[PDB]
Every structure is written in structure tokens, then in C-alpha cells.
Design a protein around this ligand. Sequence first.
Ligand SMILES: [Ca+2]
Length: 100
Amino acid sequence: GKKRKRSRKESYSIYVYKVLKQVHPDTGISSKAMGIMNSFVNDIFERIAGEASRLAHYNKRSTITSREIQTAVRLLLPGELAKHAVSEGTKAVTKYTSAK
DNA sequence: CGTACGTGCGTTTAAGCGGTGCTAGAGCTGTCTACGACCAATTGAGCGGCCTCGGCACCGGGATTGTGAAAAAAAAAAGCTGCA
Ligand SMILES: [Ca+2]
């Protein structure tokens, strides 16, 4: 083998895979398709975060809470997508708090 | 070529003005603490490296689809005959 480790490069791909095997267990994903799924996750991270950042800033608050994320989500996603995304985020917070 | 629009009348209507009267609720001050930054030790999830092996890229060949020309079936539209 050869010396010097290539420098770390973060991605979401192991989590895209994991979600992929829930939804379509007998289905894989190409190299460039994963590059797209990455570019997607990063896009929506940025959009949501930015809007929450602004919401917090408008109402004179230092802290982004799950509340901000929800409001941003309601502003950014279309109708049905927002509902489900609001449900799942709520579920996730509810579940996380009670498992402390 | 047909009539949907623009024009210019009168007729009707409620927008706007100025004023008064109430109070929801914006928006502030002060007190308290739960909740997040911070740190340090801990230590597994996630990384880069690497090796298999089955899906996809590609090929050839046959089956199917689809276009288009020119040749039928049919419809149609005029000229010809008789016609109560
Ligand atoms: Ca890997």
C-alpha cells in the first residue's frame, strides 16, 4: 500500500444508503446520483438553517430552537412536504426528549 | 368580414375625509432559572483504503412500429336522361 492518508471529505452517503434500504431494500444507487443526493441535502440544510438564522435575528433572539426550524420549514417546503416534514421533526423531537 | 372593444355621455354609489370613542394587544421593565456554551476525558461512528463479482454498457440479430408512396374502395359532385 501507499503512504499519506487522503484528507477527510465529509458526505451524507452512508445515511442516504440507510434511508435507501428502508424505502427500497432491493435498490442501489450510482456514483453521480449520490453526488446529487449530497448536493440536495446540503442545499436544503443551507436553506432551512439560513431562514431559521433570519427568524431568530428578526425576533432579536440568539438561539435557534426546534421552533425556528419548524417555521423555516413551513416557509420553504410546499404544502404536503411541509406537513410530513413537520410531523417527522415533531416525532423526532418528542421521541428524543422522552429518551432524554 | 364581424363585433369586441374604446368613447362619452348620464346615473348611481361608496371611497375618502375628518372626527370621536374603546381597548386589544404591542411592547416594555425587572426577576429567575432552566438550558445551552464550555471544558476535558472517553471511545465508537465514520473515514480511506482495497478487493470481490454482479449489474450495466455494449453488441448482433431478429421482431415490431411507423412513415410514406401509389394504388383501391367509396363518396361525392357534377352533367345527362327522362319526368308527373
Ligand atoms: Ca468506502
